[model samples]
Target: KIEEGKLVIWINGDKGYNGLAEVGKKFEKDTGIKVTVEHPDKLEEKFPQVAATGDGPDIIFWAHDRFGGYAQSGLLAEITPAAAFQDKLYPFTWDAVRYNGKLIAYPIAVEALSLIYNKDLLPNPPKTWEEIPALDKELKAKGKSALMFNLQEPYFTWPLIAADGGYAFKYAAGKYDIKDVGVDNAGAKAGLTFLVDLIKNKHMNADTDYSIAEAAFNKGETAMTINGPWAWSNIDTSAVNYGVTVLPTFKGQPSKPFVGVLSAGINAASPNKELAKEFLENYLLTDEGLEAVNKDKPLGAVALKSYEEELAKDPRIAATMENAQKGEIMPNIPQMSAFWYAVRTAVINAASGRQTVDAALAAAQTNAVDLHFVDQYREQLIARVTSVEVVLDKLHGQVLSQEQYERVLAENTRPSQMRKLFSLSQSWDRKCKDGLYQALKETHPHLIMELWEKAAAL
Candidate 1:
């Protein structure tokens, strides 16, 4: 067919293409337009730079948390979704895609962590965290773990933090306040204390990672776990009878896991803007389109209310939607980039008894501030390096030594090295961020504690 226009979509993961390909083919057949659906590896990681050049697909499908950076960079379109269309999705789903008051993406699916318990192992899962210790004692007598989860992963650890009143960023005046960090507050300590007890009682182990946790639960070695929809496919239902429900309450308050919505955002700079818009809004978001997307049992909870009603016939999707409704929306702001490793470090150190509760939380607070400080200040610092004296004194203002200042200046002098320095400095990934922090400590010892402490209070 001779097409009037062409549309291209980029989706992450192999399963995503499987879910959308038939719908894409149907659109091409009906519209006399060429539609190409491509699966790219690490789509979220590559999307920002690719879209910035205006060379990527017309549409991108990924998690909503990434919309903030793309929207801020002017790479995402300002989509004023119809009031009726907006009303069709869950309220929190809309909350996830609204960046600075503009709806920038089409919500697709909603996901949140829930208590996944084996029915045979425990006819009744604990209703509260307090009851877990006795359950752990009973499980131990039978050579099984009462509960298991990735202790070192921040995503799974966040519900506990919320249960204790710790929040990553406070939303005020219609925006997330980066200055607000509740990770080390008394409520956070209470939550960490609960985790520490689990570790101390041998209910879980420090070295238990996501894979270990998943394998244990699937193999019937663990009675319960905390995980999201993405992990559901890995569970061998034939071997384990599992059920999903809302997370247990902590001190009479329900645990609030972060709700992540998967969405499709149009590239602002796409040449086929109108065609892309038509394809997404008028064609792909139709009931038929959503039905195609949810063809698989393991597909996540869809955002469309009607599709949700259809999918809810399956216990898994119903459980996921129910759990997500009880949770808070995950913040999509760039400040969230600084939250992961810092919080993960606190959870690990405290659970492993490597540091006292106070000391570990303090360390996490320091790391969070330091990471966020560099992200917030990197551009200003980069601009300052053009004038050697300006860069030197800025370092000195932070109490950096003369030798440290000289080294930083040298790194800034070369284009390639300077680019690497900034990339490492502002990264939010665990290894990259942690490595940069340690490098800073080694190169500029005196500046760290004071600067980090000051930033922590920012």
Candidate 2:
């Protein structure tokens, strides 16, 4: 057990380190605990390794999407808050923290994209997705476009995919079925086809990435844009009369954006588990702590119901809440990571006309299945490697040599070296390559030789 006054917490300080430190001070004062808030770089990659040694932080603050992988690996504590405590937060927020029916994190705030419109140019936002083509034509003479968004980013493109009836997985019974990838399904095809048509028909400019698109909207070069609350501060509200609203409809169906929840998780390996739990439940969940956490910033919508009246006064928060109500909660499964790579490539391929929509989506489906298989195998390899490290750590003899163990640790920690070790292992001994080859074959037995040949070529 940790000493009564010593408690260390690690946060994704990239988000808001100064603010988190201030909150840490508040907790320290209230609990008589000397809280140290430290920001460790690349915490995502380093956390699992360090925390597994049982010398990591008592609490970890981060977004909830990675909760699944951490929970699956037994890195997070399963928390059961009283029903009264649960009722104090939004129900959707709870969904983000729950992995396999167990609550693994405490949600703080939510984020979702909304339609931000230039009221002076458009007067009224488009009610349907079909209105965009004609609206673009009408505004072209005035040096304005109907809409401009990051055409290359799947984050923004996902709403259109959902409107076209696409989904990452068919979620049910508190779990996601990895086999049910829907990127190549009819709904996704329809969505991809629509995006391709927009590019080909000049309604959307293929050259406009995020920077160009945001600049166009800020300069009033575009009549409307789809973005989130994070973009609000950067937007020049003084230069343009703009309003935020839910994304327009697509074929009579509302475009559903992904709702992301930012949350805090306790480390299962921490020595001061009781203290950490008490700090989270007693102090951080209170109004004062939340206010300090979000002070001097617009954090979209927060989970605390008590703050609703205060938040509704702000137009940005109001718009965010409306969109959030209409949005789908982002699935926090590890398979969702595979979906990002697959759908991103599919969107880019179709939008660029490098492949037909159907062909691109089919390729994405195949890649996703292959990637999922590889991911499972990769996890197995990581566990085995970790097992080897534990044995090396315990060694004290000159026979094994400390130099050898340090080299292995260094190789895994360095990005370039790790890539060279794992990705470039094809030329190593047959036994060294056999494990991965066997995994690929089991996952893609029919296409094993083809896949290996392509990798060998690389």
lDDT of 2 by residue, 178-204 (tens): 777777888778877887888899999
lDDT of 1: 0.72
Query: In candidate 1, what are the lDDT values of residues 95-121, reduced to their tens digit?
Result: 789887789898888877889999999
Error of 1 at 278 (Å): 3.3
TM-scores across all candidates?
0.73, 0.72
- Which 10-residue span in candidate 1 carries the lowest summed lDDT? 377-386
Report model 2's TM-score to 2 decimal places: 0.72
* Per-residue error (Å), model 2, residue 123: 1.8
Poorest stretch of ten by lDDT in candidate 2? 419-428
